[PDB]
Design a protein around this nucleic acid. Sequence first.
RNA 1: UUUUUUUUU
Length: 949
Amino acid sequence: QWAIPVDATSPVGDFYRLIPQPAFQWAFEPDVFQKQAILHLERHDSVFVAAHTSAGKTVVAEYAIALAQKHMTRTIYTSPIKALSNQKFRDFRNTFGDVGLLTGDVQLHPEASCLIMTTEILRSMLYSGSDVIRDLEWVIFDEVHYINDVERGVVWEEVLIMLPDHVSIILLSATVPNALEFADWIGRLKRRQIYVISTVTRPVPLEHYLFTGNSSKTQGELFLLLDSRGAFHTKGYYAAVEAKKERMGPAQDRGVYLSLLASLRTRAQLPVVVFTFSRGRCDEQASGLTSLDLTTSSEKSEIHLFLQRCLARLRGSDRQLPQVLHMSELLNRGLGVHHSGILPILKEIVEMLFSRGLVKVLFATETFAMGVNMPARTVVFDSMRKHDGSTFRDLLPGEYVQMAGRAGRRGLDPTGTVILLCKGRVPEMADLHRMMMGKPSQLQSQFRLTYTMILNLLRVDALRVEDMMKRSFSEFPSRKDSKAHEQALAELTKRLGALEEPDMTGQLVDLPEYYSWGEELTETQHMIQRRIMESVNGLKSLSAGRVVVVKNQEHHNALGVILQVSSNSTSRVFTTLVLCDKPLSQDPQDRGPATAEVPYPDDLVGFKLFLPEGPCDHTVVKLQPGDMAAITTKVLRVNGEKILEDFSKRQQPKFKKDPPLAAVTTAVQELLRLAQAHPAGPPTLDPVNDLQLKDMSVVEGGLRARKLEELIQGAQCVHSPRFPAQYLKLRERMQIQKEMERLRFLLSDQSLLLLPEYHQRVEVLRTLGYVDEAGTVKLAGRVACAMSSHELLLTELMFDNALSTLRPEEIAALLSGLVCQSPGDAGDQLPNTLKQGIERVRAVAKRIGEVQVACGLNQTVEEFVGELNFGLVEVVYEWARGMPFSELAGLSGTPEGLVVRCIQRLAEMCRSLRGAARLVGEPVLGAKMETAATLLRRDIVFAASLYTQ
RNA sequence: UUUUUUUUU
């Protein structure tokens, strides 16, 4: 089975009869699904929790560590966000003993038994041994719905395969629908059974209101469009639209926010989290608001004392700059901002002052929605559309669920209200329906090949790269029933030894090739037949007065004339009068499966016109497009309406004995004479030479058919006495051979979709000097292995003598072009040396893109070289001399958070280069970069975290 | 006009 879907609610009745000494004891009672998850964690199973609220999963995520600390063993807790894995660090150090943390720069206590890591580091310490993996029991994958990401979903699937069998896995999730085809994949990729627990109905449910502006001075009206019972209320939506109708940027929005906070302050719904969707819009209304003073005296005193004790670590001028003062003023009134263009010390101050209720309004953004939990009372949105990938799209359902989920608090309020704040135009409830309710999202797999995996797998001998592709989740549906495919192959290989070898010497010489001619020609006509009904020109021909040949299990190439064409052009049902033999029977028991009709030449040229052996009766059948063998050229102007008013009238069981109508008799006699008048079927309405079409495929098909008919009309096998038996036996073996071939291909190695891209990348890799022939890593490959990003470009640049001959205060500016991810530009007040190094680096990028595009890869040289985005070179060059921050702030118009982030991101390459400069043997760039690194990190750019020390 | 991660030796 490999995946056990344990029932969420039914099984557990006795949680304390067994397990009477829980490894951890809370201050309240764990509910049913957490009881079941702990019940399965007791027996050393591997649960897959899928819950809503972040505080329901960490009861398991710390009971597993209480068990880990009880046994002296070790556990690795992995979270994707670098800032989310610090408050967890604080809570695990406060709750019990030693918990080490490892991130891009922090290495706090790398010897504990709760190392907290980002998965991109565990993927880096799986390629080597690292001697920690010998001691694990549990690996708590925290947020496992980042597989659906496009730029990091490959890490979780590179990790989940290489993990050995003895290491148990815990997968916390966010209630995705398709949990049973993923836990089954992990269950049968390893050989352990996996239990799935999924919950709904988070406590303290939430009412989704809608606030539309009116009488912005005091009046606030809230319309209910969703309730505690899931019932959609359209009445509120309608009320909103009329409310917008009677009335029919910053000065109005200020009154909108003062009306919202005026109707909110009258009640106790104070701790309100506004979600804005752009940092300029986020700080604009916070600047323009400018008078609330929502804070009393004692909380003002506590805020002031706390804020100076926390800020007084850093030096003097560094605590007096515009943002710090402005933010302190806002906090003094009780207002905060939490966007991504602010210093991390202020994101941290706002979050640590929001978890104790000393701030009342937060103009947060999605980073607060993901990186922390800290539940608040009332969440208010600000818009419906965001700008993700330059398409300025509408917000999709999965996100909304999370922010709405952090609306209710736990036992400090009855429920939680989520207020949407549509202001510009009507809410357009139609898309609100599928966004605000809807199955959250499936679980995809964004697997792709990078150079790092290829190098770190060629480096090792016992692992092959196609192994990783076969074990990949994007191959799971294909490779699901692999044991059944191989068993079918192995049990039909036995069957192959069975059939006798026939003798074709003489009259049977061309029997196999003839066989081939029979199938393909037939297939061709069907393709041509498809090219007949799919055409718009057939759609003009398809009308009353059309005779067709009908071919299905009931009618065997019986000639019919269509009475009418259905008005519904989707399901083409044709009421058509077709001649058939008068039924000389009423009992289905004499009818049985008969001999498989061998194709004779008389059967393979056109359609053998059936001549009824009995009297010429009629039927009127409701025909499909696929049941008609041919569209005949004849135009019989018969009037369908009277024939319908006669057949449908007569088809009363009581009216089966009506006298025939003249139109029916005339149609039957004319059809019968036409049946006699063509020896094997009249010519069809030619697709090209009669319908005036120009598709090449139909012309090749028609000429191939003509050549095959001429060839088939001379076969010698048709005259042999034992033609049918040997022939049918050959048919059976040929089908078995074809299905075996397809079966082996599906089990073969060419099935992998990305294999040609693997070959092309390997070839381009070997064209540079990184891998010898027959796939053995060379020295440049081993250099490019241990690199963070852009390994190829960095190692090629390092090996060449471009950078070697520059100043240490200039190499930082040269490397600043790889990291900024910001709108870029050139400079004016720059030395000459930087100004020629930029063309050299860009020329190297052009060379790399030209060797990339000259191998088979599809990435144009311009799109590859456009990743090089200089424009922080001057700022980093001035910063890495001793120049203080204020001049940097003045210099140019970019928010000082996206600059400080770039500076640590640069200090992590002038530290990931210590590993390659010490391995190639070039100790003078190492001795310049180990200076250029210690001269760049001195102050609030690299200020230590608050809840770290 | 979003967010975003890549230890040690």
